[PDB]
Amino acid sequence: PKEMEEYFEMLQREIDKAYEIAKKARAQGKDPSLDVEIPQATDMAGRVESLVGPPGVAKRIRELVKEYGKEIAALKIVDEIIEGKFGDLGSREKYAEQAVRTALAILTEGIVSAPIEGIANVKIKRNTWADNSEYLALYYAGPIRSSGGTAQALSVLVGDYVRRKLGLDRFKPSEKHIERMVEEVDLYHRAVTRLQYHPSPEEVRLAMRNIPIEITGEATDDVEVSHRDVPGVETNQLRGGAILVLAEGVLQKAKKLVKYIDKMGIEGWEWLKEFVEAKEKGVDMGFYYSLYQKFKEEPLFSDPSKPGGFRLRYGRSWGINPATMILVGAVVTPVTTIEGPIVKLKDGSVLRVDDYNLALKVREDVEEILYLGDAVIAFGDQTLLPANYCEEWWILEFVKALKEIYEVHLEPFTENEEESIEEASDYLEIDPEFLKEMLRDPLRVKPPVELAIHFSEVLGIPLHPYYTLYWNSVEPKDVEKLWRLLKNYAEIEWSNFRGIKFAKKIVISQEKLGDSKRTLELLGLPHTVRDGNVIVDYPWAAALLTPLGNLNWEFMAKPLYATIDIINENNEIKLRDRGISWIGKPPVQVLFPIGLAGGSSRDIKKAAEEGKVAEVEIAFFKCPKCGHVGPEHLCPNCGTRKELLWVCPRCNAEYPESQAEGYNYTCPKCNVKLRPYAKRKIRPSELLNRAMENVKVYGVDKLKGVMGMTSGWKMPEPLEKGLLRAKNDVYVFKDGTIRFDATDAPITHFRPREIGVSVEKLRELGYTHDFEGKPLVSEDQIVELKPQDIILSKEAGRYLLKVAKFVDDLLEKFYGLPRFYNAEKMEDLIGHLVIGLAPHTSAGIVGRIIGFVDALVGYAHPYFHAAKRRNCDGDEDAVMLLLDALLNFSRYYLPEKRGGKMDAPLVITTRLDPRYYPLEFYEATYELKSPKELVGVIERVED
Ligand SMILES: [Zn+2]
Ligand SMILES: [Zn+2]
């Protein structure tokens, strides 16, 4: 649709405006990179290319996914990479690395960080202790944990496919290789991290003897092992990344992994299928009174007489009348054919409200909601509730009676044969066009009460449910009382249709009726109060008196009988129950290490004020122009971009980036690897005073940094960024972003009034029509939510306003750029963009703020925060302002070792591109079955 395409284009314009500002800011060289560190993508193909490449892959992925699906496509890409279709990548090791990252990113839809943060390296090595044959090794980093077990297990299968395509042999561990792993898993689980799945020593041996690649990595934890100096294992400490992949990946997710091996047809994994099966192999009573009794056996201020909730309605696939939306995981959808609420007005009048227009008219006069309305819930879903009598059930009984009595064959919810409609019309004394419409749409086309009664009389069918009151909501003793008051004090006007005598109008004094007025309300009887009288007009006078036999038989309360049981025992016209079932800190301002110098609160301002010196592991930069050394990116003397100094951890020799690159990040006269940082003496007073001068902000209360950096780089964030955060009362996350940790609920529809946004604002946002396709002109209209449009809580809005003020201060004071947001109130953020990031994911989704709710839980479209991610059991989301993330996020701030629940936005997604049950079903709900038993019932009926 052109409306959706225009929406996606509007978002691109807004995204591009944010990237142009951030590119200008980053070009200045005050940050770890001269570029914006968050690439954007349209789709999973684009996510793959943007994250790990190779260039031109996204185009191939689209073609391959369209032909073969995601799983097979990943293998086809590995083949093409190795064949050189994406250019000469150089060494077999560079081809292996590219094919590993790309294929794993394809399989994980570019949603997780395993291809970037999880795999540090891919190496070709030899089984020197064995046959000296070549094999593939994957070097896993501790942050692999952030991607979940499924991603970890798939990296192993990808590694195996890649090594086979490169013609490499299998990894053939020595007995010392296997035992070191057994030891490592034990020591890791015991004192580092408790494994989600803790394998037995023999399970570790099984995995180790059968995984065809080496699951390895650099040391993640300073914990010495006893199986030391193993050939090919370049550490004597714990390889946490590897341990996680083996236990929490391959063994924990072994059942999910075998499904992938099956979809992909990879051989040599029978040992894993055998592991999965081994884990598996080791006085009389009334009908309704009886039904309500069995039904029980299977808020304190609330009215006991009033049943709580919506009237259950089984759907063949949630569904709510627009009038109940105005007057009152699951997603609500407007359905105009089902029933709305039953309301009592201030004047005492009782009314059914089944349309949007009537709901608006009575809204100001509603005194009580007697009945909430229907809720259409799909049977697809374990105790199953008895079905409420409804038009769907009644129409089936109506057509069964025509077949049984007259041999006329008719079907509901379809076009019928003219001759059959005519035959039945002649027997029923009705209009063929009326019958056609009632059969086609029984929820919309109801007969008048006299014809409903005539249908029951002729066909022996229960009274139509539209004319069935909530008889069983009332105790039989109260119907008995009501009966006497009507018999003695009511003035009744009668009518006669084809020999059927029925009530046309009931007039009873409010005085004479008394307490029984409450019985009429509980019955859901529509009535009016005028001139001290209760008046029951047509068709409701017959709905009341026809089940009571026009007061020709006396209603008497009987023990162990429900009201409908008494009616059904004594009345010619029979009923079914229309209402039996009812439903319903933070502690950091700047990423800057202060050690113990800022006391217990890591206060940089206190450290600088007390003239304290800090000894912290921190990265230093050398100026090539003058020679200045310090923790900043730009030179404070000549303003030229400074070069990172690499340090040898032994001789403490300093080597600038280019010199370190020549020496392959290894000291030229020590065989030990260089570090981008060292333990250094820091003088916060000179650093903070310069930062204060730069941004012209002095009056900060406190400035909370970190005790130490958890990144591999230990490259601090500029203090200027912290000063502006403290000024704006905002706090930073580990990666340089500011996040609001929210809980959101899925929605598909909204009303402007409910989100506190005007019709004109929404028209400017591109909303043209309501759910019915009618022009959007009222704040009360029900509107369909656009896929990336989100409603935040007022709590989110209150914090985000502060973030917008920090971004604007940063742009102007630190970057010398114009302000962007200019927000004073949270409503100024409507139309502005955010990044939504779910737990265990590294692909954020672009969202547009369209409104705010007074509640703690915000709203988003089901596509924005999928039920699948919500089943990876995080209803929590993190929200960042788009521009805050583009300016302030850096991969150089990512944790080196710890992989938690919350990951980073490694990429952002800019586009989110997208009859009836048989009679036997309804009858079977009365015999209290489960849906397993009932699906069998429906499947057998559909021969
Ligand atoms: Zn300089
Ligand atoms: Zn050295």
Residue numbers in the entry: 4 to 285, 308 to 323, 339 to 357, 365 to 375, 393 to 445, 451 to 653, 668 to 997, 1006 to 1034
Paper text:
The DP2 construct covers amino acids 1–1,050 from DP2 DNAP subunit, leaving out a C-terminal domain (CTD; 1,051–1,270) dedicated to interaction with DP1 (refs 13, 14). The DP2 structure reveals an extended molecule with overall dimensions of 55 × 60 × 110 Å3 and four domains: the N-terminal domain (NTD; residues 1–285), the central domain (residues 308–667), the catalytic domain (residues 668–996) and a fragment of the CTD (residues 997–1,039). The most prominent feature of the DP2 architecture is the extensive interaction between the NTD and catalytic domain, which results in a wide interfacial crevice that hosts the DNAP active site, formed by two double-psi β-barrels (DPBBs). Unexpectedly, PolD DP2 and ‘two-barrel' RNA polymerases (RNAPs) share a conserved architecture in their active sites. The peptide chain connecting the fifth (β31) and the sixth (β32) β-strands of the barrel forms a right-handed α-helix followed by a 10-residue-long loop, which constitutes the most conserved sequence motif of DP2. This motif comprises two invariant aspartic residues (D961 and D963), which were previously shown to be catalytically critical for PolD DNAP activity. In particular, the peptide chains connecting the NTD to the central domain (residues 286–307), strands β7 to β8 (residues 358–364), strands β8 to β9 (residues 376–392) and strand β18 to the catalytic domain (residues 654–668) were not visible in the electron density.
PolD exists in all Archaea, except Crenarchaea, and is a replicative polymerase responsible for initiating DNA synthesis at both leading and lagging strands5678. It is composed of a large catalytic subunit (DP2) and a smaller subunit with 3′–5′ proofreading exonuclease activity (DP1)5. To help resolve the uncertainty concerning the evolutionary origins of D-family DNAP, we determined the crystal structures of two large fragments of both DP1 and DP2 subunits of the Pyrococcus abyssi PolD. While the interaction between the two subunits is essential for the full activity of PolD71413, both DP1 and DP2 constructs described here are capable of digesting mispaired 3′–5′ nucleotides and of extending a DNA primer in a templated manner, respectively.
